[PDB]
Amino acid sequence: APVDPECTAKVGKAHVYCEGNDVYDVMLNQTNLQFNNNKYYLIQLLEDDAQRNFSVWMRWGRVGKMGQHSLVACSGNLNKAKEIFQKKFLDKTKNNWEDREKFEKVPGKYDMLQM
Amino acid sequence: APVDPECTAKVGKAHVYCEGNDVYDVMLNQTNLQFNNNKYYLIQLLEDDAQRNFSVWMRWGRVGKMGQHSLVACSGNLNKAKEIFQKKFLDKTKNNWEDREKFEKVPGKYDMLQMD
DNA sequence: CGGTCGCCTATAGGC
DNA sequence: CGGTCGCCTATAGGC
Predict the structure, then answer these.
(1) Which residues form the WGR domain (chain B)?
(2) In the complex, which nucleotide's C1' lies nearest to the CA atom of residue B67?
(3) CA A2, CA A10: separation in Å to the nearest integer?
């Protein structure tokens, strides 16, 4: 549910977008001790409290460290933000956002934690 | 479920292909008295009795008259015949073959008459 | 593969 | 559209 604290520009001024049972916040993990992988990938779709104004927030890196990030603004174009979000999730999990109740991790890609 | 009599080349030598609940024989109708439409379109996928050899049979025209037709042969390629068949049905009904239990006629397109 | 970019191909649609 | 065509573009995916 919460805006990711590291999103300094929007924590306070915004909330994670929801609609029914869809909630656009996800945390991905890939751990593989053989090749030295202990990394996260976080994605959020953010509506401002101020107006109907949108943005997608992505942050990634080694567990522990605060990593690097990307904020992508979408003005009032909810459809765009949803695409960007869904597409990113897909690139990193090889599952669709829509089929996440039946999530199945794939070798070589990130796994998902439930919220 | 019969080979269409007008298919002279294959009536006697062949039968309508079936596969589970799928039976590849369909009759389409478009009647619209306002624009003067009283036309059928018949499609059949035919397996020979002789061997595993395939063909799609299409006949169409004004109700009453025997119209024109097209026989398309597919040798042993069942998959091809099924595509040709399904694709034609789609062009003329704007429904998929797969979803025909829940068929919904579309304005401007053919309707499907449900067999026996 | 964190980011991002961009051929080629195979279709699907407009005309 | 009842048959057939074939350009050109826009689009989506694989690599």
Answers:
(1) 13-110
(2) D2
(3) 11
| A70 CB less than 7 Å from any atom of strand C | yes
Burial of A78 (0-12, 13-18, 19+ CB in 10 A): middle
Work out the end-to-end distance of chain B between its first and last CA atoms, rounded to an integer number of angstroms.
Answer: 9
Residue A6 token pair: 């590291």
How buried is residue B27: exposed, middle or buried, by Cβ count under 10 Å (0-12/13-18/19+)? Answer: middle
- Is A100 within 7 A of strand C by CB distance? no
Cβ of B38 near strand D (distance < 7 A): no
C-alpha distances (whole Å) from A31 to each of A58, B31, B70 are 19, 64, 60
- The reply to whether B109 Cβ lies less than 7 angstroms from strand D is yes
Report yes or no: B26 and B95 within 8 Å, Cβ to Cβ: no
The residue among A76, A47, A71 whose CA lies nearest residue A58 is A71
Dist CA B6 CA B102 (whole Å): 30
CA distances from A10 to A20, A48, A61, A71, B116 (A): 23, 8, 20, 10, 65
- B37 CB less than 7 Å from any atom of strand D: no
Parallel, antiparallel, or unpaired: how do β-strands A14-16 and B68-73 relate?
unpaired
Looking at residue B70, its amino acid is: S
Resolution of the solved structure (Å) = 3.0
Nucleotide nearest B41, CA–C1', reads: D2
